[PDB]
PDB file of C-alpha atoms and ligand atoms in Angstrom:
ATOM      1  CA  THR A 381     -21.362 -11.764 -88.148  1.00 23.35           C
ATOM      2  CA  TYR A 382     -17.914 -12.571 -86.462  1.00 21.27           C
ATOM      3  CA  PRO A 383     -14.717 -12.331 -87.399  1.00 21.93           C
ATOM      4  CA  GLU A 384     -13.320 -14.365 -90.155  1.00 23.64           C
ATOM      5  CA  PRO A 385     -10.499 -15.777 -89.506  1.00 23.15           C
ATOM      6  CA  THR A 386     -11.562 -16.168 -85.849  1.00 24.43           C
ATOM      7  CA  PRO A 387      -9.502 -16.365 -83.712  1.00 24.82           C
ATOM      8  CA  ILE A 388      -9.117 -18.889 -80.522  1.00 25.47           C
ATOM      9  CA  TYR A 389      -6.869 -19.021 -77.385  1.00 25.44           C
ATOM     10  CA  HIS A 390      -5.423 -21.672 -75.211  1.00 24.86           C
ATOM     11  CA  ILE A 391      -3.729 -20.446 -72.159  1.00 25.62           C
ATOM     12  CA  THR A 392      -1.040 -22.799 -70.343  1.00 25.69           C
ATOM     13  CA  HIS A 393       1.352 -22.902 -68.475  1.00 28.51           C
ATOM     14  CA  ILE A 394       5.151 -22.880 -69.865  1.00 28.56           C
ATOM     15  CA  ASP A 395       6.472 -25.892 -68.019  1.00 30.41           C
ATOM     16  CA  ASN A 396       3.177 -28.029 -70.642  1.00 28.69           C
ATOM     17  CA  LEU A 397       4.693 -27.016 -73.879  1.00 28.32           C
ATOM     18  CA  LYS A 398       7.539 -29.749 -73.676  1.00 27.09           C
ATOM     19  CA  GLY A 399       4.803 -32.203 -72.706  1.00 27.75           C
ATOM     20  CA  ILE A 400       2.537 -30.809 -76.098  1.00 27.29           C
ATOM     21  CA  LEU A 401       5.413 -30.457 -78.680  1.00 25.00           C
ATOM     22  CA  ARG A 402       6.520 -33.975 -77.799  1.00 25.37           C
ATOM     23  CA  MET A 403       2.793 -35.658 -77.950  1.00 22.51           C
ATOM     24  CA  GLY A 404       2.284 -33.188 -80.712  1.00 21.30           C
ATOM     25  CA  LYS A 405      -1.030 -32.277 -79.326  1.00 21.57           C
ATOM     26  CA  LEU A 406      -3.067 -31.081 -76.108  1.00 19.94           C
ATOM     27  CA  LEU A 407      -4.869 -33.991 -75.281  1.00 21.87           C
ATOM     28  CA  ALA A 408      -8.335 -33.144 -72.940  1.00 20.91           C
ATOM     29  CA  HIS A 409      -8.468 -33.638 -69.213  1.00 18.46           C
ATOM     30  CA  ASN A 410      -9.941 -36.975 -69.991  1.00 15.83           C
ATOM     31  CA  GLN A 411      -6.640 -38.168 -72.137  1.00 13.56           C
ATOM     32  CA  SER A 412      -4.392 -37.753 -69.297  1.00 14.98           C
ATOM     33  CA  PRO A 413      -2.456 -35.319 -70.983  1.00 16.23           C
ATOM     34  CA  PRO A 414       1.174 -35.611 -68.942  1.00 12.75           C
ATOM     35  CA  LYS A 415       0.268 -31.819 -67.499  1.00 14.05           C
ATOM     36  CA  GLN A 416       3.233 -29.782 -64.850  1.00 16.35           C
ATOM     37  CA  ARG A 417       0.699 -27.334 -63.883  1.00 15.30           C
ATOM     38  CA  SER A 418      -2.687 -26.890 -63.453  1.00 17.68           C
ATOM     39  CA  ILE A 419      -3.266 -22.846 -63.537  1.00 20.19           C
ATOM     40  CA  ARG A 420     -16.506 -29.911 -66.164  1.00 20.53           C
ATOM     41  CA  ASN A 421     -16.397 -34.466 -65.317  1.00 20.08           C
ATOM     42  CA  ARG A 422     -20.348 -33.198 -65.001  1.00 21.13           C
ATOM     43  CA  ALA A 423     -21.024 -30.394 -67.209  1.00 19.42           C
ATOM     44  CA  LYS A 424     -23.119 -32.212 -70.478  1.00 19.07           C
ATOM     45  CA  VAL A 425     -22.271 -31.525 -73.891  1.00 17.99           C
ATOM     46  CA  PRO A 426     -25.003 -31.411 -75.438  1.00 17.97           C
ATOM     47  CA  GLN A 427     -23.977 -31.692 -79.417  1.00 14.99           C
ATOM     48  CA  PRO A 428     -22.264 -34.350 -80.742  1.00 13.85           C
ATOM     49  CA  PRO A 429     -20.040 -35.540 -79.943  1.00 14.24           C
ATOM     50  CA  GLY A 430     -21.011 -35.285 -76.495  1.00 13.92           C
ATOM     51  CA  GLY A 431     -19.794 -36.410 -73.771  1.00 16.19           C
ATOM     52  CA  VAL A 432     -18.696 -33.572 -70.837  1.00 15.40           C
ATOM     53  CA  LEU A 433     -16.480 -30.894 -71.237  1.00 15.33           C
ATOM     54  CA  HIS A 434     -13.372 -32.841 -69.790  1.00 15.33           C
ATOM     55  CA  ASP A 435     -13.582 -34.596 -72.904  1.00 14.78           C
ATOM     56  CA  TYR A 436     -12.107 -31.540 -74.802  1.00 16.87           C
ATOM     57  CA  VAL A 437      -9.375 -28.775 -75.367  1.00 17.52           C
ATOM     58  CA  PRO A 438     -10.674 -26.059 -73.974  1.00 18.31           C
ATOM     59  CA  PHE A 439     -10.446 -22.183 -76.242  1.00 19.51           C
ATOM     60  CA  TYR A 440     -11.908 -19.117 -75.573  1.00 17.22           C
ATOM     61  CA  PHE A 441     -12.231 -16.458 -77.922  1.00 15.34           C
ATOM     62  CA  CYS A 442     -10.584 -13.963 -76.413  1.00 18.06           C
ATOM     63  CA  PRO A 443      -6.720 -13.100 -75.361  1.00 18.50           C
ATOM     64  CA  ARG A 444      -6.707 -11.299 -71.577  1.00 17.72           C
ATOM     65  CA  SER A 445      -9.043 -13.353 -70.355  1.00 20.45           C
ATOM     66  CA  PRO A 446     -10.907 -13.396 -66.724  1.00 22.66           C
ATOM     67  CA  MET A 447      -9.310 -17.081 -66.396  1.00 26.26           C
ATOM     68  CA  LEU A 448      -6.176 -15.039 -66.963  1.00 26.21           C
ATOM     69  CA  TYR A 449      -6.955 -12.315 -64.407  1.00 24.87           C
ATOM     70  CA  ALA A 450      -7.686 -15.334 -61.676  1.00 22.28           C
ATOM     71  CA  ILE A 451      -3.694 -16.225 -61.620  1.00 19.49           C
ATOM     72  CA  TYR A 452      -3.104 -12.684 -61.894  1.00 18.67           C
ATOM     73  CA  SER A 453      -4.698 -11.501 -59.078  1.00 16.45           C
ATOM     74  CA  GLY A 454      -3.537 -15.491 -57.502  1.00 15.85           C
ATOM     75  CA  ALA A 455      -6.850 -16.430 -56.665  1.00 14.32           C
ATOM     76  CA  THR A 456      -6.270 -19.338 -58.785  1.00 15.52           C
ATOM     77  CA  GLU A 457      -4.511 -22.300 -56.795  1.00 18.71           C
ATOM     78  CA  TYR A 458      -1.828 -21.836 -59.126  1.00 18.50           C
ATOM     79  CA  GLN A 459       0.495 -18.825 -57.207  1.00 19.15           C
ATOM     80  CA  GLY A 460       3.037 -18.825 -60.157  1.00 20.93           C
ATOM     81  CA  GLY A 461       1.133 -15.424 -62.032  1.00 20.20           C
ATOM     82  CA  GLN A 462       0.386 -14.642 -65.214  1.00 20.37           C
ATOM     83  CA  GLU A 463       3.972 -14.018 -66.357  1.00 20.06           C
ATOM     84  CA  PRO A 464       4.476 -17.645 -67.520  1.00 18.03           C
ATOM     85  CA  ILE A 465       1.160 -18.409 -69.075  1.00 18.21           C
ATOM     86  CA  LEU A 466       1.652 -18.646 -72.812  1.00 14.95           C
ATOM     87  CA  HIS A 467      -1.349 -18.201 -75.182  1.00 16.40           C
ATOM     88  CA  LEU A 468      -1.791 -20.726 -78.222  1.00 15.19           C
ATOM     89  CA  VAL A 469      -3.472 -19.512 -80.719  1.00 13.69           C
ATOM     90  CA  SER A 470      -5.309 -20.973 -83.870  1.00 12.46           C
ATOM     91  CA  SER A 471      -9.001 -20.515 -85.233  1.00 12.43           C
ATOM     92  CA  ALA A 472     -12.144 -22.010 -85.609  1.00  9.13           C
ATOM     93  CA  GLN A 473     -12.088 -22.307 -89.661  1.00  9.06           C
ATOM     94  CA  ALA A 474      -8.353 -23.942 -89.146  1.00  8.30           C
ATOM     95  CA  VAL A 475     -10.063 -26.789 -86.975  1.00  8.89           C
ATOM     96  CA  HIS A 476     -13.555 -27.604 -89.592  1.00  3.58           C
ATOM     97  CA  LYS A 477     -11.250 -27.789 -92.533  1.00  2.39           C
ATOM     98  CA  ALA A 478      -9.444 -30.389 -91.047  1.00  2.00           C
ATOM     99  CA  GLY A 479     -12.460 -32.382 -89.701  1.00  2.00           C
ATOM    100  CA  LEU A 480     -11.495 -32.394 -86.443  1.00  2.00           C
ATOM    101  CA  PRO A 481     -14.796 -32.796 -84.030  1.00  2.00           C
ATOM    102  CA  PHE A 482     -15.392 -29.624 -82.010  1.00  2.00           C
ATOM    103  CA  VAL A 483     -18.773 -27.909 -80.268  1.00  2.00           C
ATOM    104  CA  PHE A 484     -18.556 -24.039 -78.642  1.00  2.00           C
ATOM    105  CA  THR A 485     -20.999 -21.718 -76.514  1.00  2.00           C
ATOM    106  CA  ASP A 486     -22.229 -18.954 -76.191  1.00  2.00           C
ATOM    107  CA  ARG A 487     -21.159 -18.265 -72.351  1.00  2.00           C
ATOM    108  CA  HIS A 488     -19.037 -20.336 -69.701  1.00  2.00           C
ATOM    109  CA  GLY A 489     -19.444 -23.517 -70.505  1.00  2.00           C
ATOM    110  CA  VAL A 490     -20.199 -24.841 -67.137  1.00  2.00           C
ATOM    111  CA  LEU A 491     -23.742 -22.843 -67.149  1.00  2.00           C
ATOM    112  CA  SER A 492     -26.556 -24.647 -67.219  1.00  2.00           C
ATOM    113  CA  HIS A 493     -28.037 -22.298 -69.876  1.00  2.00           C
ATOM    114  CA  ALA A 494     -25.177 -21.992 -72.261  1.00  2.00           C
ATOM    115  CA  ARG A 495     -25.985 -22.779 -75.949  1.00  2.00           C
ATOM    116  CA  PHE A 496     -23.747 -25.052 -77.817  1.00  2.00           C
ATOM    117  CA  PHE A 497     -23.403 -25.129 -81.855  1.00  2.00           C
ATOM    118  CA  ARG A 498     -21.072 -27.403 -84.221  1.00  2.00           C
ATOM    119  CA  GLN A 499     -21.147 -24.794 -87.262  1.00  2.00           C
ATOM    120  CA  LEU A 500     -19.382 -22.390 -87.473  1.00  2.00           C
ATOM    121  CA  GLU A 501     -22.226 -19.872 -89.517  1.00  2.00           C
ATOM    122  CA  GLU A 502     -23.441 -19.937 -85.652  1.00  2.00           C
ATOM    123  CA  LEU A 503     -20.420 -17.579 -84.497  1.00  2.00           C
ATOM    124  CA  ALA A 504     -23.133 -15.426 -85.232  1.00  2.00           C
ATOM    125  CA  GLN A 505     -24.959 -16.107 -82.651  1.00  2.00           C
ATOM    126  CA  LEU A 506     -22.166 -15.207 -80.111  1.00  2.00           C
ATOM    127  CA  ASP A 507     -21.947 -11.124 -78.581  1.00  2.00           C
ATOM    128  CA  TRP A 508     -18.201 -10.216 -80.250  1.00  2.39           C
ATOM    129  CA  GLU A 509     -18.572  -6.962 -78.214  1.00  2.00           C
ATOM    130  CA  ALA A 510     -18.462  -9.214 -74.949  1.00  2.00           C
ATOM    131  CA  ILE A 511     -15.869 -11.654 -75.761  1.00  2.00           C
ATOM    132  CA  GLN A 512     -13.715  -8.001 -77.031  1.00  2.00           C
ATOM    133  CA  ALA A 513     -14.659  -6.497 -73.552  1.00  2.00           C
ATOM    134  CA  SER A 514     -11.745  -4.849 -71.961  1.00  2.00           C
ATOM    135  CA  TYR A 515     -14.006  -4.369 -69.020  1.00  2.00           C
ATOM    136  CA  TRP A 516     -16.209  -7.035 -68.703  1.00  2.00           C
ATOM    137  CA  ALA A 517     -16.136  -7.717 -65.058  1.00  2.00           C
ATOM    138  CA  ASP A 518     -20.477  -6.277 -64.936  1.00  2.00           C
ATOM    139  CA  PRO A 519     -22.661  -6.683 -65.415  1.00  2.00           C
ATOM    140  CA  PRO A 520     -23.290 -10.473 -65.255  1.00  2.00           C
ATOM    141  CA  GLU A 521     -24.407 -10.875 -68.968  1.00  2.00           C
ATOM    142  CA  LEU A 522     -21.675  -9.841 -70.407  1.00  2.00           C
ATOM    143  CA  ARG A 523     -18.923 -11.518 -68.478  1.00  2.04           C
ATOM    144  CA  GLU A 524     -20.744 -14.620 -69.013  1.00  2.00           C
ATOM    145  CA  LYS A 525     -20.518 -13.977 -72.926  1.00  2.00           C
ATOM    146  CA  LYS A 526     -16.832 -13.296 -73.363  1.00  2.00           C
ATOM    147  CA  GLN A 527     -16.150 -16.833 -71.936  1.00  2.00           C
ATOM    148  CA  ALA A 528     -18.085 -18.060 -74.560  1.00  2.13           C
ATOM    149  CA  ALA A 529     -15.731 -21.460 -75.663  1.00  2.00           C
ATOM    150  CA  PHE A 530     -15.054 -22.947 -78.870  1.00  2.00           C
ATOM    151  CA  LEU A 531     -13.950 -26.625 -77.329  1.00  2.00           C
ATOM    152  CA  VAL A 532     -12.189 -30.052 -79.562  1.00  3.58           C
ATOM    153  CA  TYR A 533     -12.807 -33.290 -78.545  1.00  3.60           C
ATOM    154  CA  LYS A 534      -9.768 -35.266 -77.417  1.00  3.72           C
ATOM    155  CA  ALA A 535      -6.890 -33.488 -78.628  1.00  2.00           C
ATOM    156  CA  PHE A 536      -5.402 -30.250 -80.770  1.00  2.00           C
ATOM    157  CA  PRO A 537      -2.580 -31.165 -82.825  1.00  2.00           C
ATOM    158  CA  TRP A 538       0.321 -28.810 -82.589  1.00  2.00           C
ATOM    159  CA  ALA A 539       0.332 -28.444 -85.459  1.00  2.00           C
ATOM    160  CA  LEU A 540      -2.355 -25.592 -85.831  1.00  2.00           C
ATOM    161  CA  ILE A 541      -0.811 -23.571 -83.577  1.00  2.00           C
ATOM    162  CA  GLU A 542      -0.132 -20.656 -85.611  1.00  2.00           C
ATOM    163  CA  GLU A 543       1.705 -18.280 -83.113  1.00  2.00           C
ATOM    164  CA  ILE A 544       2.591 -18.805 -78.869  1.00  2.00           C
ATOM    165  CA  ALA A 545       1.619 -15.164 -77.449  1.00  2.00           C
ATOM    166  CA  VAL A 546       4.333 -14.736 -74.458  1.00  2.00           C
ATOM    167  CA  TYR A 547       4.004 -11.893 -71.932  1.00  2.04           C
ATOM    168  CA  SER A 548       8.224 -10.913 -71.714  1.00  2.00           C
ATOM    169  CA  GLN A 549      11.810 -11.261 -74.114  1.00  2.00           C
ATOM    170  CA  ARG A 550      12.340 -13.570 -71.362  1.00  2.00           C
ATOM    171  CA  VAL A 551       9.421 -16.215 -71.516  1.00  2.00           C
ATOM    172  CA  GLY A 552       9.878 -15.589 -75.624  1.00  2.00           C
ATOM    173  CA  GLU A 553      13.601 -16.463 -75.000  1.00  2.00           C
ATOM    174  CA  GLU A 554      12.456 -19.675 -73.162  1.00  2.00           C
ATOM    175  CA  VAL A 555       9.588 -20.608 -75.847  1.00  2.00           C
ATOM    176  CA  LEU A 556      12.376 -20.717 -78.548  1.00  2.00           C
ATOM    177  CA  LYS A 557      14.977 -23.034 -76.271  1.00  2.00           C
ATOM    178  CA  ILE A 558      12.173 -25.656 -75.701  1.00  2.00           C
ATOM    179  CA  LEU A 559      11.189 -25.366 -79.778  1.00  2.00           C
ATOM    180  CA  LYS A 560      14.680 -25.964 -80.696  1.00  2.00           C
ATOM    181  CA  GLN A 561      14.381 -29.445 -78.597  1.00  2.00           C
ATOM    182  CA  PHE A 562      11.629 -30.323 -80.786  1.00  2.00           C
ATOM    183  CA  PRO A 563      13.441 -29.862 -84.336  1.00  2.00           C
ATOM    184  CA  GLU A 564      10.269 -31.825 -86.568  1.00  2.00           C
ATOM    185  CA  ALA A 565       7.058 -30.209 -84.630  1.00  2.00           C
ATOM    186  CA  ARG A 566       5.587 -27.422 -86.137  1.00  2.00           C
ATOM    187  CA  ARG A 567       7.604 -24.191 -85.101  1.00  2.00           C
ATOM    188  CA  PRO A 568       4.646 -21.138 -84.878  1.00  2.00           C
ATOM    189  CA  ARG A 569       5.549 -17.826 -84.051  1.00  2.00           C
ATOM    190  CA  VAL A 570       6.542 -16.482 -81.230  1.00  2.00           C
ATOM    191  CA  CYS A 571       5.399 -13.011 -80.392  1.00  2.00           C
ATOM    192  CA  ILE A 572       5.370 -10.301 -76.763  1.00  5.45           C
ATOM    193  CA  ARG A 573       2.030  -9.208 -76.352  1.00  2.78           C
ATOM    194  CA  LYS A 574       2.450  -7.305 -73.592  1.00  2.00           C
ATOM    195  CA  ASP A 575      -1.917  -5.897 -74.794  1.00  2.00           C
ATOM    196  CA  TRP A 576      -3.115  -9.863 -73.934  1.00  2.00           C
ATOM    197  CA  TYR A 577      -1.519  -9.098 -70.416  1.00  2.00           C
ATOM    198  CA  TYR A 578      -2.945  -7.472 -66.799  1.00  2.00           C
TER     199      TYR A 578
HETATM  200  N1  NAD B 617      -7.157 -23.211 -70.262  1.00  2.00           N
HETATM  201  C1  NAD B 617      -7.849 -22.152 -71.362  1.00  2.00           C
HETATM  202  O1  NAD B 617      -7.843 -21.565 -72.283  1.00  2.00           O
HETATM  203  C2  NAD B 617      -9.312 -22.249 -71.547  1.00  2.00           C
HETATM  204  C3  NAD B 617      -9.810 -22.154 -71.822  1.00  2.00           C
HETATM  205  C4  NAD B 617     -11.584 -21.890 -72.339  1.00  2.00           C
HETATM  206  C5  NAD B 617     -11.832 -22.342 -70.746  1.00  2.00           C
HETATM  207  N2  NAD B 617     -11.223 -23.419 -70.055  1.00  2.00           N
HETATM  208  C6  NAD B 617     -11.815 -23.110 -68.543  1.00  2.00           C
HETATM  209  O2  NAD B 617     -10.419 -23.667 -67.536  1.00  2.00           O
HETATM  210  C7  NAD B 617     -10.967 -24.642 -66.957  1.00  2.00           C
HETATM  211  C8  NAD B 617      -9.527 -25.314 -66.735  1.00  2.00           C
HETATM  212  O3  NAD B 617      -8.557 -25.015 -67.525  1.00  2.00           O
HETATM  213  P1  NAD B 617      -7.158 -25.827 -68.382  1.00  2.00           P
HETATM  214  O4  NAD B 617      -6.659 -25.339 -69.056  1.00  2.00           O
HETATM  215  O5  NAD B 617      -6.924 -26.513 -67.041  1.00  2.00           O
HETATM  216  O6  NAD B 617      -8.097 -26.688 -69.205  1.00  2.00           O
HETATM  217  P2  NAD B 617      -7.885 -28.504 -69.550  1.00  2.00           P
HETATM  218  O7  NAD B 617      -9.307 -29.479 -69.067  1.00  2.00           O
HETATM  219  O8  NAD B 617      -7.359 -28.193 -70.688  1.00  2.00           O
HETATM  220  O9  NAD B 617      -6.480 -29.111 -68.394  1.00  2.00           O
HETATM  221  C9  NAD B 617      -5.929 -30.406 -69.107  1.00  2.00           C
HETATM  222  C10 NAD B 617      -4.337 -29.514 -68.786  1.00  2.00           C
HETATM  223  O10 NAD B 617      -3.117 -30.096 -69.248  1.00  2.00           O
HETATM  224  C11 NAD B 617      -2.365 -29.234 -69.982  1.00  2.00           C
HETATM  225  N3  NAD B 617      -2.017 -30.144 -71.844  1.00  2.00           N
HETATM  226  C12 NAD B 617      -3.377 -30.482 -72.554  1.00  2.00           C
HETATM  227  N4  NAD B 617      -2.017 -31.124 -73.498  1.00  2.00           N
HETATM  228  C13 NAD B 617      -1.119 -31.419 -72.994  1.00  2.00           C
HETATM  229  C14 NAD B 617       0.545 -32.052 -72.752  1.00  2.00           C
HETATM  230  N5  NAD B 617       0.143 -32.944 -74.018  1.00  2.00           N
HETATM  231  N6  NAD B 617       1.345 -32.036 -72.129  1.00  2.00           N
HETATM  232  C15 NAD B 617       1.186 -31.017 -71.414  1.00  2.00           C
HETATM  233  N7  NAD B 617       0.362 -30.547 -71.005  1.00  2.00           N
HETATM  234  C16 NAD B 617      -0.590 -30.979 -71.667  1.00  2.00           C
HETATM  235  C17 NAD B 617      -3.827 -27.806 -70.460  1.00  2.00           C
HETATM  236  O11 NAD B 617      -2.788 -26.795 -71.392  1.00  2.00           O
HETATM  237  C18 NAD B 617      -3.856 -27.797 -69.636  1.00  2.00           C
HETATM  238  O12 NAD B 617      -2.960 -27.128 -68.907  1.00  2.00           O
HETATM  239  C19 NAD B 617     -11.368 -25.711 -68.383  1.00  2.00           C
HETATM  240  O13 NAD B 617     -11.901 -26.443 -67.632  1.00  2.00           O
HETATM  241  C20 NAD B 617     -13.000 -24.966 -68.659  1.00  2.00           C
HETATM  242  O14 NAD B 617     -13.800 -24.452 -68.045  1.00  2.00           O
HETATM  243  C21 NAD B 617      -9.529 -22.952 -69.746  1.00  2.00           C
END
């Protein structure tokens, strides 16, 4: 079995929010998103619609990801830390109800041994205890499975985002200031969630 609804999470720097609201969508790497801050070109997707991982907008099935810990620890090229990083929240069911092409994996999608699925019933193939683990570093099988991904082909409409989660009051205020510049954009919930950060 699997959680229903099935939340999906995309992390991005706050400096990218204006470009997302202006476009009305997240764009996949290969669709040239007007990103301001960076925080897969040969990793083939074997389910339709195919292409490579950079053809999809990527989500995890958990907040507080290993990627976020690399950002927190200054391991990434980006050196601004976790506090300006938003979690944009949707659900796998909303994507499927919208008829958007998607695939998802049972583990880190860059792994040659990742399995890919295209039907929400196959969410049962994922390791939900690994996805939800707070102590995820070891063993390797667990860490790989924590990074199961939900991939939406080409573009992801802003209207499907139900919540922007933030680290702090100050970041929440900055998000509300940006949303107010786009009065016709859907206004999701804005929530401070320290338990989603390190
Ligand atoms: N970001 C995540 O939550 C996430 C989820 C699962 C997997 N991953 C893995 O991490 C890698 C790096 O992730 P990434 O987030 O750099 O990946 P990405 O390939 O999605 O990079 C695109 C960047 O542009 C931003 N962006 C998209 N549309 C935009 C728009 N209209 N205006 C401005 N900015 C826009 C995205 O938020 C992101 O920061 C991925 O290639 C994947 O292997 C990331």
